[PDB]
């Protein structure tokens, strides 16, 4: 069964670094694109970062570039999201999503977000 299990989120003091953990079931993440989309109550859906299916290209929104970096290990099927030097705006319900694959050859600027996991919230609390 296809599912995404997210863990490691929680209360983080500002300035402290936390590394998310996520596992995938029902497929191989090395063939599919994966999205990090935080959701905040009273706000709009926010996109943080993506990891390429082959891992060649990694892109970050201007509010997370260089400060939050994503890593993958496909041998164990795990994805680690790094949250360095937390700021208050990072308090949102973070989700992980899965996208299309090389199986259906698709043009550039890939499309995705067909399934996503239960999502884990990080709360930047003082």
């Amino acid at each position: 069964q296809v599912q995404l299990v997210e863990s490691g989120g929680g209360v983080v003091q500002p300035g402290r670094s936390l590394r998310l953990s996520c596992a995938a079931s029902g497929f191989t993440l090395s063939s599919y694109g994966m999205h990090w989309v935080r959701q905040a109550p009273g706000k709009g859906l926010e996109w943080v970062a993506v990891i390429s299916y082959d891992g060649s290209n990694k892109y970050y929104v201007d509010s997370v570039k260089g400060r939050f970096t994503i890593s993958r290990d496909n041998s164990k099927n795990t994805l680690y999201l790094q949250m360095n030097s937390l700021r208050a705006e990072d308090t949102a319900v973070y989700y992980c999503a899965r996208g299309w694959a090389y199986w259906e050859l698709l043009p550039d600027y890939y499309y995705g977000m067909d399934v996503w996991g239960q999502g884990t919230t990080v709360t930047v609390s003082s």
Partner: protein, 49 residues
């Protein structure tokens, strides 16, 4: 007397050619019977050997 005068031989009539089967072939069905096709800009480039 005796006179060595002529030379004779027997000539063939048909030909035969042989080759070690056709066991290996070039798989080209996946090109025509492709599940999905490539975009206009950029393309799959399949090298055959």
């Amino acid at each position: 007397g005796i006179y060595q005068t002529s030379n004779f031989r027997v000539q063939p009539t048909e030909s035969i050619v042989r080759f070690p089967n056709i066991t290996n072939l070039c798989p080209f069905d996946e090109v025509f019977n492709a599940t999905r096709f490539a975009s206009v800009y950029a393309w799959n480039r399949k090298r055959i050997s």
